[PDB]
Amino acid sequence: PIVQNLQGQMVHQAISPRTLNAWVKVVEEKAFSPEVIPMFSALSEGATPQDLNTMLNTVGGHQAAMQMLKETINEEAAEWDRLHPVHAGPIAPGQMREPRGSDIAGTTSTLQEQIGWMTHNPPIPVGEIYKRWIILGLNKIVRMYS
Known part of the structure; x- marks a missing residue:
């Protein structure tokens, strides 16, 4: 998850052992x-x-x-990636680079990039987007085993 530390920064915190064990x-x-x-x-x-x-x-x-x-x-x-291809060129001050599919899935994005998107104003909600993909997959699995 994302927390605000004592020094005011938005930073990563590990998943609670209770959440993961659940x-x-x-x-x-x-x-x-x-x-x-x-x-x-x-x-x-x-x-x-x-x-x-x-x-x-x-x-x-x-x-x-x-x-x-x-x-x-x-x-x-x-x-x-088909719908939201990355545009070649420089990133404007205060803005973030555009996330590709692999950035959303966390394989080519740094943890700091992820938090930067998720806590951007307005949010670039890569956590929610990846969640949607995973829930799509879980739905297919449930259907296969039902």
């Missing part, structure tokens, strides 16, 4: 029943893309599910 538990106890979705949605409140990847990595033992998630994230990242 996610581990839902995946281990409920497999991919429908309740995995509202649980994911609740537990990822305020999550950066880095945080979301930390959560996704606990699903690594489930190969078919992970492959479906990866495929869905890839499709959504590709559609994002």
